[PDB]
Amino acid sequence: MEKSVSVILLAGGQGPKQYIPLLGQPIALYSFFTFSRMPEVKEIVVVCDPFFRDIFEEYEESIDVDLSFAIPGKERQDSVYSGLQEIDVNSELVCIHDSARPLVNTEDVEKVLKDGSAVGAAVLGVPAKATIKEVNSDSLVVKTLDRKTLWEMQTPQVIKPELLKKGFELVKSEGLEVTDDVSIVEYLKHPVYVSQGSYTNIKVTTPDDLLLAERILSE
Amino acid sequence: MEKSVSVILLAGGQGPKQYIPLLGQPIALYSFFTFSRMPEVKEIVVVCDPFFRDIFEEYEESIDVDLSFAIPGKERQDSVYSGLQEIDVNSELVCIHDSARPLVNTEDVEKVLKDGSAVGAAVLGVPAKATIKEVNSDSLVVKTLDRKTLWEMQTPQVIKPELLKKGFELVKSEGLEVTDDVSIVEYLKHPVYVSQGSYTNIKVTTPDDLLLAERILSE
Ligand SMILES: O=c1c(Cc2ccccc2)c(Cl)nc2[nH]cnn12
Numbered sequence: 001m002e003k004s005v006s007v008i009l010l011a012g013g014q015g016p017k018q019y020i021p022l023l024g025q026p027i028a029l030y031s032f033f034t035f036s037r038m039p040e041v042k043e044i045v046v047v048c049d050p051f052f053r054d055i056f057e058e059y060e061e062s063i064d065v066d067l068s069f070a071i072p073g074k075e076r077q078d079s080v081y082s083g084l085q086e087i088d089v090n091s092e093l094v095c096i097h098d099s100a101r102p103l104v105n106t107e108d109v110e111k112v113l114k115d116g117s118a119v120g121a122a123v124l125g126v127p128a129k130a131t132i133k134e135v136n137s138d139s140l141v142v143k144t145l146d147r148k149t150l151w152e153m154q155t156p157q158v159i160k161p162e163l164l165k166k167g168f169e170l171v172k173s174e175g176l177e178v179t180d181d182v183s184i185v186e187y188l189k190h191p192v193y194v195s196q197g198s199y200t201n202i203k204v205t206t207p208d209d210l211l212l213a214e215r216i217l218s219e
Numbered sequence: 220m221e222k223s224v225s226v227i228l229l230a231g232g233q234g235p236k237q238y239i240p241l242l243g244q245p246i247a248l249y250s251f252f253t254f255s256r257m258p259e260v261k262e263i264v265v266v267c268d269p270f271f272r273d274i275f276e277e278y279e280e281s282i283d284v285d286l287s288f289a290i291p292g293k294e295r296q297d298s299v300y301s302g303l304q305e306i307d308v309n310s311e312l313v314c315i316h317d318s319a320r321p322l323v324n325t326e327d328v329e330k331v332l333k334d335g336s337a338v339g340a341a342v343l344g345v346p347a348k349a350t351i352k353e354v355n356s357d358s359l360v361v362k363t364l365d366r367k368t369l370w371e372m373q374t375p376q377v378i379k380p381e382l383l384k385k386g387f388e389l390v391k392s393e394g395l396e397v398t399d400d401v402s403i404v405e406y407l408k409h410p411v412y413v414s415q416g417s418y419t420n421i422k423v424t425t426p427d428d429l430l431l432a433e434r435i436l437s438e
């Protein structure tokens with residue numbers, strides 16, 4: 001559905017890597033433009049410090065979405081909630097994206113949007129390549145014989161706004177801890193789909209990442 | 220205990236990245252030399268294709284360990300087993316290392332050796348930074364409310380040889396699947412300690428990794 005999705009673009013982190021260029025363009029703008037071109041996307045709520053607004057506002061008349069801003073909160077989830085208060089009163093779906101993932105492919109965004117529409121909550125993920133284990137408080141491996149297949153979550157995270165709101169309300173009403181980027185939905189009974197993305201959708205955290213990102217962009 | 224540990228250096232993978240230089244020295248030699256200098260280490264069994272033996276044999280008279288070779292097997296575990304058949308009949312401990320991890324620090328090797336001696340089985344690991352979840356066959360997140368803290372396993376993997384042998388025998392006698400780098404020990408009831416290592420102990424898999432490795436070596 002055209003113009004049914006609101007994007008919350010998380011660009012509130014502080015050194016900032018998401019404004020450093022790749023091929024002359026600030027990292028945040030890559031995903032921003034990917035989303036703007038998609039007919040599905042009605043609006044982009046950028047969550048960023050006022051200082052960086054111009055980075056995005058420069059393109060406002062050139063992009064085929066509405067542009068809005070929200071103020072960052074203290075933790076990532078707070079930034080999500082801030083963006084959430086700015087989305088359209090009738091968008092059917094919210095698409096949360098870390099601006100430090102510039103390389104997300106349109107085709108993968110399309111996938112997670114569809115899955116999110118279908119299921120109600122979906123996140124892009126890839127199978128974890130390393131050997132990963134739970135470790136207990138005595139620093140021992142928690143052993144599994146069964147087939148635990150672990151996936152690394154990326155973004156977008158796509159969710160029906162009502163469902164997200166229900167999660168934030170539960171976490172507030174019960175004072176629940178939020179310890180990774182899917183904790184809010186984990187407290188709900190509603191299913192979360194994992195849409196298979198691409199290993200190229202890396203998050204730029206380190207200086208190493210800047211050249212890797214630039215090197216993928218080479219294509 | 221001086222000269223109590225046998226190292227199995229896994230260098231049988233095939234493009235090969237573990238022989239590509241960092242600062243002019245083949246990646247495999249970095250960990251090789253780290254181990255050779257440690258008084259604990261009696262011997263290094265290198266598991267590598269005969270073609271590359273000279274890479275290591277060149278240094279034989281210069282290193283304070285015995286050097287032995289084993290032939291790679293088909294899968295990593297087979298390479299482990301091949302090396303295992305070459306270690307000293309009385310070493311108290313075997314230290315399995317991926318040669319593609321050149322940056323392992325002496326101090327972290329010392330830690331996992333101690334832990335392995337104490338517990339019987341230990342592996343170097345670091346806390347996973349990404350959000351990682353189990354995903355079921357319907358591509359849904361397997362939700363946890365509890366505090367699952369996930370760690371990424373590195374090498375060394377340090378184990379009493381008898382315990383390793385018992386694992387390989389069990390996996391053979393029962394035809395058990397080996398699907399990640401701790402599966403053999405997971406079938407045993409004996410505990411596996413996770414020694415906290417360093418995020419710098421990366422595995423060189425990609426071309427990206429070669430520059431990251433080189434860039435860490437800069438120090
Ligand atoms: O559950 C969420 C979600 C919502 C979500 C999760 C997975 C799939 C779709 C939406 C978001 Cl966007 N951010 C955080 N931080 C902590 N938990 N959390």
Ligand SMILES: O=c1c(Cc2ccccc2)c(Cl)nc2[nH]cnn12
Pocket residue numbers: 295296299315340341342376377378383386397399400401402403404405411
């Ligand atoms: O359990 C092992 C071990 C032994 C081990 C695991 C963890 C700690 C110490 C030794 C090794 Cl070296 N390699 C593999 N491949 C598959 N399983 N597996």
Ligand SMILES: [Cu+2]
Pocket residue numbers: 203204205206208209
């Ligand atoms: Cu990175």
Ligand SMILES: [Cu+2]
Pocket residue numbers: 422423424425427428
């Ligand atoms: Cu890598």
Ligand code: NA
Pocket residue numbers: 058
């Ligand atoms: Na401009």
Ligand code: NA
Pocket residue numbers: 277
């Ligand atoms: Na030489």
